[PDB]
């Protein structure tokens, strides 16, 4: 029963159209509880999960402040970066930042993170030890030295190892009836036809939470997994997820096939026939 | 680090002044506080960057600018008797990165007064050790005494044979008000210097109690049979009695 | 309001331990400090804690309990020089407002391996209209009361230290302007140790 807190920040440059965009979302596992959008109205850090609505003025006032700080630094990074690579002001670029923590079943610290991306690809990341930085190019080195002098690793690790897990635990308890819930997939299989020869088998996993799941095709112990079709686990819109897999076989060799549904809401990995 | 001037300043209700502040650390977040016995530190104004400035817990009576990132000048348009306090300017990195530590400046002391007369400079006086203590503890304590001065803006020190001593000195922490009743009550300050009779009884060594006073400028209008309390260095001296 | 440092007026002897407590209200606080303020001076940052636990670097030890939102500073080995008022600061972020506690005044009271209470009288080059009784060598546990007769002044005790002799001593002075001045009277308002050497 592991859990985690993640914060995702996206900032996009608007060549000739004013200030860049700043979206900020905060999750607890596969559930979101906060957001900030420069484009929005309130212009404050807003709740997105009802159990976060219980924190007071002190919380939101602080969180709003820090996200505007995060925005401010990012606003700057876009210009800094553009300089680094000497790119033109005419085009738009993207910056993304992600940091958080993982706790085990004992709910204690377990992992800490902090990746930084530019134009869709790693720019700099904190190593697992939380004392070292990984740069992706000559530009990103400058950032590396710059940060190794300001003591980012020092402060972040304190955050990641301490306050991150302390607050994650607080949320978990508060979102008791929501975050600690584990929904089992309502599996079932369907059968469609292409011709007088090949049929298509599709396994369905529905209403499951968390998203962690591994649907599998199998032939009495073999790997019918090279030629099949997987779909990105998709949200249902109500806090649960959906996913499916399918294979082709001539209207026949269809009773010997197996679907291996793996999810933490299931004691034993499910198996099916039709 | 953080530097600020002046050190001490005396003023008259309605006068204008600007407390200076600077930081040589490439910090973005500078602030200004005022410390009073009953409230401790209290923010007045504060800036997170250049061209950025904002109100604090007590912004009434103060203005503030931030053209550069290194200076943060606090301004009193028309002084007031309540502005009398100690001002500390502090700075913080902000979004600049580094130790999230805030550092304070040395501070400035300011005493305002409706009538710029009570700028009384001090009257220093040294008192020689007693034949009892010199004969007893075989040690000699000299008590100095600065009195009648106002404001309480003084720096007193002990100078023996042309050097300053800190070894046996022990002047009072913060001065007293001679008349604990008055509004423009003058002050008095004390200090001690202990020494071995062998040193005090030596005819050739000279003791001087120095008191730096901070008063009116040399360009301050004035005229009542009495000099300007200009920043003086009123002293008192004493010699030994091998007696 | 926000932060509360336990007690204003405080005290502690030599070589001992000094415990300062601090309590904050914003659960979201993430950076805690301890400042030291010598009378008439600026607060010198002396301790920073970023994780809850024990940081013991120097002769100072800092404790942080986020669950109880409490902050500590224990000074092992008390020197009289530590005599100062300790300020406690807390904040949320790089843009949060630093929050201080009223400050808790600490006092390192020196022991006198050998007490020698006494009241001496010392005069000065007569052009001065005043005489002074120097009350010296009291027991660390004596207190100099106030002055009853206004036309008569007082001074609050101060510790003096001699480096080469390893001798310190407590003292206070009394002085004023009028034909009637007794040193017995001077400290007729306090726990003057009996042993007062009153020569004249």
């Amino acid at each position: 029963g592991s859990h985690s807190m993640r914060y995702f920040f996206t900032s996009v440059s608007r060549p000739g159209r004013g200030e860049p965009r700043f979206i900020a979302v905060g999750y607890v596992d596969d559930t979101q509880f906060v957001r900030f959008d420069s484009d929005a109205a309130s212009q404050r850090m807003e709740p997105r999960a009802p159990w976060i609505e219980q924190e007071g003025p002190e919380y939101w006032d602080g969180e709003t402040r820090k996200v505007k700080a995060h925005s401010q630094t990012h606003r700057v990074d876009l210009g800094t970066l553009r300089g680094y690579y000497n790119q033109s002001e005419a085009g738009s670029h993207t910056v993304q930042r992600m940091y958080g923590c993982d706790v085990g079943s004992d709910w204690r610290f377990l992992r800490g993170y902090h990746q930084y991306a530019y134009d869709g690809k790693d720019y700099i990341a904190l190593k697992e030890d939380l004392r070292s930085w990984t740069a992706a190019d000559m530009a990103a080195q400058t950032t590396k030295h710059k940060w190794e002098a300001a003591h980012v690793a020092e402060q972040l690790r304190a955050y990641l190892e301490g306050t991150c897990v302390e607050w994650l635990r607080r949320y978990l308890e508060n979102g008791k009836e929501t975050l600690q819930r584990t929904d089992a997939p309502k599996t079932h299989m369907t059968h469609h036809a292409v011709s007088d020869h090949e049929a298509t088998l599709r396994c369905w996993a529905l209403s499951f939470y968390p998203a962690e799941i591994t649907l599998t095709w199998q032939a009495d112990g073999e790997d019918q997994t090279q030629d099949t079709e997987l779909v990105e686990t998709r949200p249902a819109g109500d806090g649960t997820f959906q996913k499916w897999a399918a294979v082709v076989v001539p209207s026949g060799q269809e009773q010997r096939y197996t679907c291996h549904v793996q999810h933490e809401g299931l004691p034993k990995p499910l198996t099916l026939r039709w | 680090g953080v530097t600020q001037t002046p050190k001490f300043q005396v003023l008259k209700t309605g006068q204008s002044m600007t407390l200076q502040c600077a930081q040589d650390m490439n910090h973005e977040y500078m602030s200004w506080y005022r410390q009073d016995p009953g409230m401790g530190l209290r923010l007045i104004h504060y800036s997170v960057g250049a061209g950025i400035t904002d109100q604090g817990e007590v912004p009434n009576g103060y203005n503030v600018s931030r053209s550069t990132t290194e200076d943060f000048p606090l301004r009193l348009l028309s002084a007031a008797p309540s502005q009398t306090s100690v001002y500390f300017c502090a700075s913080r990195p902000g979004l600049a990165g580094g130790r999230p530590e805030q550092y304070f400046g040395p501070g400035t002391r300011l005493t305002v007064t409706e009538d710029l007369k009570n700028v009384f400079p001090p009257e220093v006086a040294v008192f020689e050790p007693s034949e009892a203590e010199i004969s007893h503890t075989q040690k000699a304590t000299l008590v100095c005494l600065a009195t009648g001065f106002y404001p309480d803006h003084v720096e007193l020190s002990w100078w023996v044979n042309g050097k300053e001593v800190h070894s046996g000195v022990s002047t009072d922490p913060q001065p007293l008000k001679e008349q604990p009743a008055l509004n423009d009550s003058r002050y008095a300050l004390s200090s001690r210097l202990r020494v071995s009779a062998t040193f005090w009884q030596n005819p050739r060594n000279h003791f001087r109690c120095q008191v730096q006073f901070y008063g009116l400028s040399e360009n301050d209008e004035w005229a009542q049979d009495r000099a300007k309390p200009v920043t003086q260095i009123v002293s008192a001296e004493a010699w030994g009695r091998a007696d | 309001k926000e932060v509360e440092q336990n007690s204003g007026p405080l005290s502690v002897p030599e070589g001992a331990i000094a415990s300062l407590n601090c309590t904050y209200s914003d659960r979201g606080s993430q950076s805690f400090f301890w400042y030291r303020q010598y009378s008439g001076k600026s607060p010198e940052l002396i301790m920073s804690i970023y994780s809850n636990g024990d940081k013991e670097d120097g002769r100072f030890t800092a404790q942080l309990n986020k669950a109880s939102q409490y902050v500590s500073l224990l000074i092992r080995d008390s020197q009289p020089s530590d005599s100062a008022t300790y300020l406690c600061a807390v904040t949320t972020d790089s843009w949060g407002k630093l929050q201080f506690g009223a400050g808790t005044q600490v006092v390192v009271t020196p022991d006198i391996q050998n007490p020698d209470p006494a009241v001496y009288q010392l005069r000065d080059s007569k052009s001065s209209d005043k005489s002074v009784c120097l009350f010296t060598d009291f027991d660390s546990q004596t207190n100099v009361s106030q002055s009853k007769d206004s036309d008569v002044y007082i001074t609050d005790k101060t510790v003096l230290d001699m480096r080469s002799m390893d001798f310190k001593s407590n003292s206070a002075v009394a002085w004023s302007n009028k034909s009637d001045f007794a040193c017995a009277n001077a400290f007729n308002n306090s726990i003057i140790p009996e042993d007062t050497f009153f020569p004249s």
Partner: peptide
Amino acid sequence: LLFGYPVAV
């Protein structure tokens, strides 16, 4: 709770 100390690349 958000981290309180971002720094620029």
